């Protein structure tokens, strides 16, 4: 199938409490594999998946050198943006940056992305064509113009089409047993009485990978979107994911209701019924 590698960076100013916090994480599909935290003791990029622990000191030194350079540009960025928005020196602000690339099921370059936010809203993004920029504010046009003059999109495109996907494929190979796995959901239902005339039917999907899943209820084969409580897919902590979907079923109607599960790990979708 399709795959992705994505790096997520957060910088948060702390006026009067020293340097800004900087946190970097890297993911392949839904699996975290590296972190850096400026507040941690080591001051190194660090492994978070077992398959990347096999990369030698050259890798770790170079990723540490680069992540610290990212930390320093974001430090300057916080000051620059505060000047752009005429903000005071007292308040805490947030920059977020995300970039990375997708390959399709032929493993070739599909999509490349790079975006940047200030205080939780879009600031600038690379367009789909990887040649131009979308600037939100009037402040972001200064950045757009800076970046156009320094030909950043050219340099970025080269990374996204070249380095980014080459290393993605390397990681997919090296971590084959983790990243090219699917864990099918293990499914069950629970039934709990609201009162005498209705009961909650909850359809569970546990221990699945990757995170993408469709969990729906139907009544007489008609979908119940409007009447289903659906929770956000949530991490189990062990690299798998959990989700549930519940509906309120009037007395005697359990047989009308079917829960439907779609996941890449399943040989065919499941149709579950309380019976």
């Amino acid at each position: 199938g399709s795959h992705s590698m994505r790096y997520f960076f957060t910088s948060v100013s702390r006026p009067g409490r020293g340097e800004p916090r900087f946190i970097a994480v890297g993911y392949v599909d839904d699996t975290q594999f590296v972190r850096f935290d400026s507040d941690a003791a080591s001051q190194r990029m660090e492994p978070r998946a077992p398959w990347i622990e096999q990369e030698g000191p050259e890798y770790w030194d170079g990723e540490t050198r680069k992540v610290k350079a990212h930390s320093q540009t974001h430090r300057v960025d916080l000051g620059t943006l505060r000047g752009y928005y005429n903000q005071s020196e007292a308040g805490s602000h947030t920059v977020q940056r995300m970039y990375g690339c997708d390959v399709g099921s032929d493993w070739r370059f599909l999509r490349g992305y790079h975006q940047y936010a200030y205080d939780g809203k879009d600031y600038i993004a690379l367009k789909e064509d990887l040649r131009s920029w979308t600037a939100a504010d009037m402040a972001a046009q200064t950045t757009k113009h800076k970046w156009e003059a320094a030909h950043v999109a050219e340099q970025l495109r080269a990374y996204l089409e070249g380095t980014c996907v080459e290393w993605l494929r390397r990681y997919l190979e090296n971590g084959k047993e983790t990243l090219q796995r699917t864990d099918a959901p293990k499914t069950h239902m629970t039934h709990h009485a609201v009162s005498d005339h209705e009961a909650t039917l909850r359809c569970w999907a546990l221990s699945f990978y990757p995170a993408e899943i469709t969990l729906t209820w139907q009544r007489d084969g008609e979908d119940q979107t409007q009447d289903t409580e659906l929770v956000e897919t949530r991490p189990a902590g062990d690299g798998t994911f959990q989700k549930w979907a519940a509906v309120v079923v009037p007395s005697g109607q359990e047989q009308r209701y079917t829960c439907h599960v779609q996941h890449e790990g399943l040989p065919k979708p499941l149709t579950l019924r309380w019976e």
């Binding site: 790096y7 970097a24 890297g26 990723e63 680069k66 992540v67 350079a69 990212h70 540009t73 300057v76 960025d77 620059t80 943006l81 752009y84 970039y99 940047y116 600031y123 600038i124 950045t143 800076k146 970046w147 320094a150 950043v152 340099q155 970025l156 990374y159 380095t163 980014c164 290393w167």
Partner: peptide
């Protein structure tokens, strides 16, 4: 692998 060629806003 990270991009090595960052730029200021």
């Amino acid at each position: 692998m990270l991009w090595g060629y960052l730029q200021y806003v």
